[PDB]
Structure 1
Amino acid sequence: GDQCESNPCLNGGSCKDDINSYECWCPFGFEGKNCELLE
């Protein structure tokens, strides 16, 4: 997939494209699927 191209991971997160979907890696301090929540 190419879902990571639109930078869906907020707050300094990094993104990996899977086949169906994507996943965010979030830095210490943020959580949620898009790193959109405070930890």
Structure 2
Amino acid sequence: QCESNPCLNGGSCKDDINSYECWCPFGFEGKNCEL
């Protein structure tokens, strides 16, 4: 399995090879919406 992509864009797995941006759900920031 993979870990869900916390980003709203790109593939379903986090660190989608074909993604460069990460649009986070409201309230979150970072390359994996950490803080």
Higher strand share: 1
When the two structures are aligned, how many residues end up with a matched partner?
A: 35
Structure 1 residue runs without a partner (length 5+): none
Alignment match, 2:13: 15
How much identity, in percent, do the aligned residues show?
Answer: 97
- The list of structure 1 runs, each at least 4 consecutive aligned residues, that deviate by more than 4 angstroms after superposition, is 3-6, 10-21
TM-score w.r.t. length of structure 2: 0.35
The CA distance in 2 between the partners of 1:22 and 1:4, in whole Å, is 18
Specify the structure having the higher radius of gyration (Cα).
Answer: 1
